[PDB]
């Protein structure tokens, strides 16, 4: 019963319960001639909520805040964008206007600024080298190395063993390597194995786009990325 694009009308958001106090969020957007779904995370942070990633644009993001208040009813206080593309930072201006403090690595902030994308307000220290990990309330943030982008982060919720892979991780039904315009195809395989090694206890794995799975998504991602390289 995971929401798909055919079930989501233009500008609307669905929420999907992943575990106690962990939801994904799902919306759709026009991109490169097609309609794409994409995912984000919501994690209970004591009496508040922590948001991971926008819902891909200002409209979608506004709809996301309203859907949260309707379904959950605890305030969104902080948001983390896991890389610089619009499916992760587009809507940051709406979040800021809503009283949400926005965060990203310095590398993500640099790259977003240079692209003309929206720019999270605050810098996350402690993530600049591959294998670096920091706590951020109810989650761990991990920089596995360049892959889908050079700045890509992954997120682990240790209380639920949920691994959120963002666009560095592909869903099973994806056969290509996605948008590789800003990708490091050479390094991706190493970054993926670094994720496998750091999170062997993961039960749910959520890709940047499409259906959740388990640890198999990481091996699938490795395969798909190799297939592209010839
Ligand atoms: Zn991206
Ligand atoms: Zn993406």
From TrEMBL:
CC per GO annotation: periplasmic space
Pfam families for this protein: Lactamase_B
GO terms for biological process, alphabetical: antibiotic catabolic process; response to antibiotic
Catalyzed reactions per annotation: a beta-lactam + H2O = a substituted beta-amino acid
Main EC class the enzyme belongs to: hydrolase
Reported cofactor(s): Zn(2+)
Subcellular location: Periplasm
A GO MF label: metal ion binding
Binding positions for Zn(2+) per the UniProt entry: 83, 85, 87, 148
InterPro entries assigned to the protein according to its UniProt record, in alphabetical order: BlaB//VIM/IMP-1, Metallo-B-lactamas, NDM-1-like, RibonucZ/Hydroxyglut_hydro, VIM-1/2/7, VIM-1/2_MBL
Family classification: Belongs to the metallo-beta-lactamase superfamily. Class-B beta-lactamase family.
Subunit description: Monomer.
Protein name: beta-lactamase
Organism: Pseudomonas aeruginosa
């Amino acid at each position: 019963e995971y929401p798909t694009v055919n079930e989501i009308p233009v500008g609307e958001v669905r929420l999907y319960q992943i575990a106690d106090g962990v939801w994904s969020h799902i919306a759709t957007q026009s991109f490169d001639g097609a309609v794409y779904p994409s995912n984000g995370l919501i994690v209970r942070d004591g009496d508040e909520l922590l948001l991971i990633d926008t819902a891909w644009g200002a409209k979608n993001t506004a709809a996301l805040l309203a859907e949260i208040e309707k379904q959950i009813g605890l305030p969104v206080t902080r948001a983390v964008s896991t890389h610089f593309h619009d499916d992760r930072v587009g809507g940051v201006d709406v979040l800021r206007a809503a009283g949400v403090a926005t965060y990203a690595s310095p590398s993500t902030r640099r790259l977003a600024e240079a692209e003309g994308n929206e720019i999270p307000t605050h810098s996350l220290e402690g993530l600049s080298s591959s294998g670096d990990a920091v706590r951020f309330g109810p989650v761990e943030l991990f920089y596995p190395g360049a892959a889908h982008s050079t700045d890509n982060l992954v997120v682990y919720v240790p209380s639920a063993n949920v691994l959120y892979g963002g666009c560095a991780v592909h869903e099973l039904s994806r056969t290509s390597a996605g948008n590789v315009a800003d990708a490091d195809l050479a390094e991706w395989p190493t970054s993926v194995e670094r994720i496998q090694k750091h999170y062997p206890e993961a039960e749910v794995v959520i890709p940047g786009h499409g259906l959740p799975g388990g640890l198999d998504l990481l091996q699938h991602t490795a395969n798909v990325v190799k297939a592209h390289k010839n």
